[PDB]
Design an enzyme around this catalytic site. Structure first.
Site, PDB file in Angstrom:
ATOM      1  N   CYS A   1    -118.677 -50.010 -87.736  1.00 12.32           N
ATOM      2  CA  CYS A   1    -118.681 -50.392 -89.144  1.00 12.32           C
ATOM      3  C   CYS A   1    -119.748 -49.615 -89.909  1.00 12.32           C
ATOM      4  O   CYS A   1    -120.680 -49.076 -89.312  1.00 12.32           O
ATOM      5  CB  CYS A   1    -118.918 -51.897 -89.288  1.00 12.32           C
ATOM      6  SG  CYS A   1    -117.757 -52.923 -88.356  1.00 12.32           S
TER       7      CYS A   1
ATOM      8  N   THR B   1    -118.484 -41.890 -71.570  1.00 12.94           N
ATOM      9  CA  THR B   1    -118.942 -40.530 -71.307  1.00 12.94           C
ATOM     10  C   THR B   1    -120.391 -40.507 -70.844  1.00 12.94           C
ATOM     11  O   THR B   1    -120.764 -39.667 -70.017  1.00 12.94           O
ATOM     12  CB  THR B   1    -118.767 -39.671 -72.560  1.00 12.94           C
ATOM     13  OG1 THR B   1    -117.374 -39.598 -72.897  1.00 12.94           O
ATOM     14  CG2 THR B   1    -119.307 -38.257 -72.338  1.00 12.94           C
ATOM     15  N   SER B   2    -121.224 -41.408 -71.367  1.00 17.11           N
ATOM     16  CA  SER B   2    -122.608 -41.474 -70.912  1.00 17.11           C
ATOM     17  C   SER B   2    -122.674 -41.854 -69.438  1.00 17.11           C
ATOM     18  O   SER B   2    -123.529 -41.355 -68.697  1.00 17.11           O
ATOM     19  CB  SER B   2    -123.391 -42.469 -71.767  1.00 17.11           C
ATOM     20  OG  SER B   2    -123.441 -42.046 -73.119  1.00 17.11           O
TER      21      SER B   2
ATOM     22  N   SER C   1    -127.425 -43.301 -73.537  1.00 23.55           N
ATOM     23  CA  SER C   1    -126.787 -43.826 -74.743  1.00 23.55           C
ATOM     24  C   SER C   1    -127.045 -42.860 -75.898  1.00 23.55           C
ATOM     25  O   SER C   1    -128.117 -42.897 -76.507  1.00 23.55           O
ATOM     26  CB  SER C   1    -127.314 -45.217 -75.055  1.00 23.55           C
ATOM     27  OG  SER C   1    -126.896 -45.674 -76.334  1.00 23.55           O
ATOM     28  N   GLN C   2    -126.053 -42.016 -76.197  1.00 16.63           N
ATOM     29  CA  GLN C   2    -126.141 -41.136 -77.358  1.00 16.63           C
ATOM     30  C   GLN C   2    -126.539 -41.908 -78.610  1.00 16.63           C
ATOM     31  O   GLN C   2    -127.379 -41.448 -79.394  1.00 16.63           O
ATOM     32  CB  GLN C   2    -124.800 -40.426 -77.559  1.00 16.63           C
ATOM     33  CG  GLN C   2    -124.794 -39.321 -78.619  1.00 16.63           C
ATOM     34  CD  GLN C   2    -124.772 -39.825 -80.056  1.00 16.63           C
ATOM     35  OE1 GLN C   2    -125.288 -39.164 -80.957  1.00 16.63           O
ATOM     36  NE2 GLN C   2    -124.162 -40.981 -80.281  1.00 16.63           N
ATOM     37  N   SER C   3    -125.957 -43.090 -78.810  1.00 13.23           N
ATOM     38  CA  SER C   3    -126.234 -43.884 -79.999  1.00 13.23           C
ATOM     39  C   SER C   3    -127.438 -44.799 -79.840  1.00 13.23           C
ATOM     40  O   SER C   3    -128.033 -45.200 -80.847  1.00 13.23           O
ATOM     41  CB  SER C   3    -125.015 -44.735 -80.362  1.00 13.23           C
ATOM     42  OG  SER C   3    -124.839 -45.791 -79.432  1.00 13.23           O
TER      43      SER C   3
ATOM     44  N   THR D   1    -125.187 -49.123 -78.029  1.00 13.20           N
ATOM     45  CA  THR D   1    -124.072 -49.732 -77.316  1.00 13.20           C
ATOM     46  C   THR D   1    -124.471 -51.103 -76.783  1.00 13.20           C
ATOM     47  O   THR D   1    -125.513 -51.256 -76.142  1.00 13.20           O
ATOM     48  CB  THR D   1    -123.627 -48.821 -76.172  1.00 13.20           C
ATOM     49  OG1 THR D   1    -123.332 -47.518 -76.689  1.00 13.20           O
ATOM     50  CG2 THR D   1    -122.387 -49.379 -75.485  1.00 13.20           C
TER      51      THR D   1
ATOM     52  N   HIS E   1    -104.863 -40.414 -49.547  1.00 17.23           N
ATOM     53  CA  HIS E   1    -104.856 -41.848 -49.294  1.00 17.23           C
ATOM     54  C   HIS E   1    -103.940 -42.613 -50.245  1.00 17.23           C
ATOM     55  O   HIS E   1    -104.070 -43.837 -50.362  1.00 17.23           O
ATOM     56  CB  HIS E   1    -106.280 -42.399 -49.375  1.00 17.23           C
ATOM     57  CG  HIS E   1    -107.223 -41.775 -48.395  1.00 17.23           C
ATOM     58  ND1 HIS E   1    -107.082 -41.918 -47.031  1.00 17.23           N
ATOM     59  CD2 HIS E   1    -108.319 -41.002 -48.580  1.00 17.23           C
ATOM     60  CE1 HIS E   1    -108.050 -41.261 -46.419  1.00 17.23           C
ATOM     61  NE2 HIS E   1    -108.815 -40.696 -47.335  1.00 17.23           N
TER      62      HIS E   1
HETATM   63  O1  LIG Z   1    -115.794 -39.813 -75.700  1.00 16.10           O
HETATM   64  C1  LIG Z   1    -116.038 -40.959 -75.456  1.00 16.10           C
HETATM   65  C2  LIG Z   1    -117.152 -41.673 -76.247  1.00 16.10           C
HETATM   66  O2  LIG Z   1    -118.206 -40.744 -76.505  1.00 16.10           O
HETATM   67  C3  LIG Z   1    -117.605 -42.941 -75.479  1.00 16.10           C
HETATM   68  O3  LIG Z   1    -117.283 -42.845 -74.099  1.00 16.10           O
HETATM   69  C4  LIG Z   1    -119.095 -43.250 -75.622  1.00 16.10           C
HETATM   70  O4  LIG Z   1    -119.831 -42.503 -74.659  1.00 16.10           O
HETATM   71  C5  LIG Z   1    -119.397 -44.737 -75.441  1.00 16.10           C
HETATM   72  O5  LIG Z   1    -118.778 -45.462 -76.504  1.00 16.10           O
HETATM   73  C6  LIG Z   1    -120.880 -45.039 -75.416  1.00 16.10           C
HETATM   74  O6  LIG Z   1    -121.602 -43.807 -75.628  1.00 16.10           O
HETATM   75  P1  LIG Z   1    -123.096 -43.986 -76.189  1.00 16.10           P
HETATM   76  O7  LIG Z   1    -123.536 -45.306 -75.556  1.00 16.10           O
HETATM   77  O8  LIG Z   1    -123.959 -42.826 -75.818  1.00 16.10           O
HETATM   78  O9  LIG Z   1    -122.965 -44.193 -77.712  1.00 16.10           O
HETATM   79  O1  LIG Z   2    -102.193 -48.149 -49.334  1.00  8.87           O
HETATM   80  C1  LIG Z   2    -103.221 -47.747 -48.876  1.00  8.87           C
HETATM   81  C2  LIG Z   2    -103.184 -46.772 -47.695  1.00  8.87           C
HETATM   82  O2  LIG Z   2    -102.984 -47.492 -46.476  1.00  8.87           O
HETATM   83  C3  LIG Z   2    -104.475 -45.923 -47.726  1.00  8.87           C
HETATM   84  O3  LIG Z   2    -105.015 -45.873 -49.042  1.00  8.87           O
HETATM   85  C4  LIG Z   2    -105.565 -46.400 -46.765  1.00  8.87           C
HETATM   86  O4  LIG Z   2    -106.204 -47.551 -47.304  1.00  8.87           O
HETATM   87  C5  LIG Z   2    -106.619 -45.324 -46.508  1.00  8.87           C
HETATM   88  O5  LIG Z   2    -105.980 -44.181 -45.941  1.00  8.87           O
HETATM   89  C6  LIG Z   2    -107.730 -45.805 -45.600  1.00  8.87           C
HETATM   90  O6  LIG Z   2    -107.215 -45.899 -44.256  1.00  8.87           O
HETATM   91  P1  LIG Z   2    -107.939 -46.896 -43.234  1.00  8.87           P
HETATM   92  O7  LIG Z   2    -108.051 -48.250 -43.847  1.00  8.87           O
HETATM   93  O8  LIG Z   2    -107.094 -46.877 -41.956  1.00  8.87           O
HETATM   94  O9  LIG Z   2    -109.297 -46.263 -42.934  1.00  8.87           O
END
Ligand SMILES: O=C[C@H](O)[C@@H](O)[C@H](O)[C@H](O)COP(=O)(O)O
Ligand SMILES: O=C[C@H](O)[C@@H](O)[C@H](O)[C@H](O)COP(=O)(O)O
Ligand SMILES: N[C@@H](CCC(=O)O)C(=O)O
Lengths: 651, 640
Positions: free
Chosen positions: B1, B341-342, B386-388, B391, B542
């Site tokens: 805001c 992003t932070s 925190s850029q800002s 947050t 996996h």
């Molecule tokens: O591109 C994404 C935004 O930049 C966002 O992820 C931001 O990083 C968060 O809203 C908090 O960032 P700050 O806490 O630094 O303001």
């Molecule tokens: O659906 C999930 C799969 O089964 C796979 O993500 C598995 O969890 C990993 O390959 C870890 O294998 P282990 O639990 O046998 O170490």
């Protein structure tokens, strides 16, 4: 990647019974995936069995075990009625690694056109290039482009250049493995050692089942380095041995097995099993609690369906003998000789991959609450890339259904080198992670034959909750909290049944998302892990782009994906984050999002304000994850079925 | 805001110069909220300024500030030619996180149908549910469903029951804030108190700018409890500027007064009492702020290291930490708490932090950090990225860690922000104002800042001297390498034309570039609205790998570090699934370049700095995809 050999010593079996046993064994190994299979057995049709022990027969084929079984009984000049008092048959299902699937590249691999030596192999011989050049320089013709053929041609080279005319089969194999590099599980057969088998492993599982109506000489096979020292029936000779890379191929014949270790060379000579090393220690004959029924679909059309719907039963097995609901106490016998040391440590580290890692995320909060220690949950592959600091007062858990996952296992050995106390949470007896950890808490969920982790995730979930309950059993201020959590575990199996009784509601949702390409699963707190796990299940099984988003992070970017077109599933339970979840729901709706909400049965507010809602029953806040993840397991299952996919097929 | 008001005292302005100043202020604050906007100003059409303060006017319109600027210069019942020697006008742009961005819910909120008391608000009232029932029982109606109307309906309740017939405006506001719970930053206007403006705060920014050709009375206004106020000495010409941010005030004057919690500013007779560079915010020659801030990173990176990194002797000195670094080294764990992003910046520097400090390094998402009540201890060092510096979740995590005795460090891009003040020490990343909605230069500056901290924590280790030189040399060469990456802008744009029609894309990386693929996936989510997801390459096998076919777009990051071989395996798996991925790799990585059709070839740097170079192509990619899809990289939908 599947091994099975059947050695009947003075237990008469016809050629048919032997072959049926080999085919029956490979059928227990198909679920691991394969492209070809073959068998090796004594040929010849001489009525007397011993005269045929110099003619090894092979029947290999690119395809499925069924086609192999057809090729077996569909043979001429092969009398199936010959009775063998002693015989060794070997079988193998192949997962093509070096050389396209084909009859010649299938196993067993032979040492020459007369089959003096044959071998079945699970793994990869890294240095097969150098070895092939050497055997070729010594006059050996290779017919297949597989790394395994190196092993067959090499054992013959040791046999051809042996010193004494009576050098042991073991000695030859010992000299073979000493030249091999990589991972392997091997079973050998040779006309020059009729009735004898030799098994050895390095970085790949291999076990030996035993059966005999006569008392056995021991239950602890001592090691022999380069009588009282080997396993055999005492007063009679009859005995049956089952080599296998997976217990599922053995459990129907016997539950007494020996798990070999790296560089062990097991040999059956004159019907007696001995275990040789090179370099008192020994290998135990142990009893498996596994049953054939536990690896059969039963009345279910797929293993995924069975393992989802039997979760009321696998949750109970995980708690059996550990949670006392008569006096509300917890006891994990696996930690009895380490619990006092674990409680003086200063940090818990959970290391796993995939859904096993989600199990840590699903229990991190309760672990922090009851242990009051820092709890780091790491992805094993990343844990290794960074060289994470680990210390002697760390307790490092390793979650692995199979107990063989490379990165998790490598994380284990990394932490052991730094002096940390290691704990294994596995679902596979004899596995590498259960062996190398200082102690373990076996998941006890029964075998998981499905490609995706269903009952393993929930049993891991419960296993860590129980450990958390152990770590605070001496705290007065937490007695009530422990009682609450344990009543929840008492009521959990019936609540799982209640969720499964909503299967119809899930099918209607799978019809809603049948045509969709993406879906965002949103949650926070105890249900962050539910998002990640459900999104992974739908990715793995359905092949659509399902993504788990931490509800608290929507406002920081991801909320931009919400509109009237993007499917959204939100998880909102009656815990301390309920008010924050309602806010996220209002953010989504405010941006034309029409989400499906998985909420509590008695959350009347959200049910009237949300069109479609899966209404799961209430549990304790730190157990809701189990109930709210099940609708996502089923959703992935039903979407795959609707789209004609084979859920048990490991894509 | 955003909040902006214009109070001209004895400075004749026409109704158009005032309305063009309110809109001009909201445009400076539009990047904080662009869902709805409104302006409050004196109406009526009299031949002076002494007969128009009895009837206020409100022009509220849905949409960005541009939708409001047109609703003002179109009304057929308003003469923009009246001269006002004294006038007060309040404006506001709203971020409608809830409900609809409709005009009635827009600000300013009024106290009745005659606009007796109007108010602008930034924050949340954590008890308007109770105040709404107290006000409805005395005969007050409610037109909107926002928590900000309760502020207008209550200041009137304190006025209809005032004790004496001469109670000040501050007295009415002081009674209101005592009945309000939560955070808020308010600026009041009325007809009863013509020309008077009251500004208070409590957990929300609010400063007051002052411009005047006459010498001001003082430079340190004294606080008053229930030669005293700021005013011009010679004459009475003065202009005040209430604003929630300094960007809307730098254009007119650089003399501001940063209020504090519970302060109650009051401009009476042009006298302010308390009770209890412009180029940095201009696009320059770029079409959007985001593109500028991306191409500005060669400079912002240098600015982050300025006066802190000496390359002649390989010295790293972060002045902000000179009074704590010795106590930070005796600590036994590092915790990085941030959002979005932070948070990625911490992921992007976790490994090197673990390497050079040898301490455990835990990176937490603030929202989840709070939900779990994470264990924290006195020997923990908690960083808050925190850029800002404002947050909510990151700031609550700060107060959470302080209560448990941890040593707190702020990594912000805003001087005077909450996080900057409440931490034991801070390190201003000095990247310049970030006007774009997506964090571009803030991420790479947070990156560099944490690397500089890592270099301080190991300056006494003989075994790490060479490793330090390697990194610092990379930082010296980094600005030019960033330029080299920006020279591929046109090459990135072509690849964007191959993906803009796709619905999803998977960005895969591991090691130092896990953060890269997470940050890139977020950027493409935020501004292009494609369903982009970051996947740890080591996790493909996996489950997630099942999602890859010849149709699913894939971007992979394969750099020359200790994970190269593993990254090659992940690539081989993608191809086996008929994937045709775009690979970001090193220029000298001829093997990868020959066997991959589409490759973005970035120059090589130090392994722990490569992430800065590997994320920039994804920044540019998000930009071009958004342009191709017809979106405005500035002002994305569903957030601010
Ligand atoms: O591109 C994404 C935004 O930049 C966002 O992820 C931001 O990083 C968060 O809203 C908090 O960032 P700050 O806490 O630094 O303001
Ligand atoms: O659906 C999930 C799969 O089964 C796979 O993500 C598995 O969890 C990993 O390959 C870890 O294998 P282990 O639990 O046998 O170490
Ligand atoms: N590497 C061998 C065996 C692989 C296996 O089945 O484990 C082959 O490709 O033939």
């Amino acid at each position: 990647c599947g091994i099975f050999a059947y050695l009947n010593y003075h237990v008469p079996r016809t050629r048919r019974e032997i072959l049926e046993t080999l085919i029956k064994g490979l059928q227990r190994l198909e679920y691991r995936g394969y492209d070809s299979a073959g068998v090796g057995f004594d040929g010849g049709n001489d009525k007397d069995w011993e005269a045929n022990a110099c003619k090894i027969q092979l029947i290999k084929k690119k395809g499925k075990v069924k086609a192999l079984d057809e090729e077996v009984h569909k043979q001429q000049d092969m009398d199936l009625d010959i009775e063998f008092d002693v015989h060794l048959g070997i079988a193998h299902t192949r997962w093509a690694t070096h050389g396209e699937p084909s009859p010649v590249n299938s196993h067993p691999q032979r040492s020459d056109k007369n089959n003096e030596f044959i071998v079945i192999h699970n793994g990869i011989i890294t240095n097969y290039k150098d070895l092939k050049k050497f055997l070729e320089s010594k006059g050996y013709d290779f017919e297949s482009e597989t790394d395994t053929e190196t092993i067959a041609k090499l054992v013959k080279y040791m046999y051809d250049n042996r010193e004494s005319q009576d050098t042991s089969f073991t000695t030859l194999v010992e000299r073979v493995i000493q030249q091999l590099e990589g991972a392997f599980a091997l079973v050998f057969k040779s006309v020059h050692f009729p009735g004898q088998a030799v098994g050895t492993r390095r970085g790949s599982p291999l076990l030996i089942g035993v059966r005999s109506e006569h008392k056995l000489s021991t239950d602890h096979i001592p090691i022999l380095y380069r009588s009282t020292t080997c396993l055999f029936p005492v007063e009679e000779k009859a005995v049956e041995y089952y080599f296998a890379s997976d217990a599922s191929a053995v459990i129907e014949h016997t539950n007494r097995v020996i798990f070999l270790e790296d560089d062990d060379v097991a040999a059956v000579v004159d019907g007696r099993l001995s275990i040789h090393r090179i370099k008192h220690p020994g290998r135990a004959v142990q009893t498996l609690q596994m049953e054939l029924q536990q690896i059969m679909k039963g009345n279910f059309s797929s293993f995924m369906q069975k393992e989802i719907f039997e979760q009321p039963e696998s949750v109970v097995n995980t708690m059996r003998g550990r949670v006392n609901f008569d006096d509300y106490t917890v006891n994990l016998g696996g930690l009895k000789d380490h619990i006092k040391e674990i409680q003086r440590c200063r940090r818990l580290i959970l290391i796993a991959c995939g859904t096993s890692y989600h199990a840590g995320v699903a229990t991190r909060q309760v672990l922090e609450e009851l242990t009051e220690l820092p709890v780091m949950v790491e992805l094993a592959s990343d844990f290794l890339d960074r060289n994470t600091p680990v210390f002697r007062d760390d307790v490092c858990f390793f979650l692995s259904q199979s107990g063989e996952t490379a990165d998790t296992l490598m994380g284990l050995r990394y932490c052991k080198e730094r002096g940390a106390l290691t704990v294994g949470i596995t679902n596979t007896v004899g596995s590498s992670i259960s062996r190398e950890t200082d102690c373990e808490v076996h998941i006890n969920a029964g075998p998981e034959i499905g490609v995706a982790s269903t009952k393993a995730y929930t049993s891991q979930f419960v296993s860590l909750v129980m450990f958390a309950l152990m770590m605070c059993d001496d705290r007065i201020s937490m007695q009530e909290r422990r009682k609450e959590i344990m009543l929840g575990l008492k009521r959990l199996p019936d609540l799982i049944k209640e969720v499964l009784s909503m299967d119809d509601e899930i099918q209607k949702l799978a019809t809603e998302l049948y045509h969709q390409k993406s879906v965002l699963i949103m949650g926070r707190g105890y249900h962050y892990a539910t998002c990640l796990e459900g999104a992974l299940k739908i990715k793995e099984i359905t092949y659509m782009h399902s993504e788990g988003i931490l509800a608290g992070e929507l406002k920081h970017g991801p909320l931009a994906l919400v509109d009237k077109l993007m499917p959204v599933i939100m998880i909102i339970m009656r815990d301390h984050t309920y008010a924050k979840c309602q806010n996220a729901l209002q953010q989504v709706v405010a941006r034309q999002g029409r989400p499906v909400v998985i909420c509590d049965k008695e959350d009347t507010e959200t049910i009237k304000n949300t069109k479609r809602t899966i209404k799961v029953p209430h549990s304790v806040d730190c157990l809701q994850g189990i109930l709210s993840v099940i609708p996502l397991q089923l959703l992935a299952f039903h979407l795959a079925v609707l789209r004609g996919y084979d859920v048990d097929f490991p894509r």
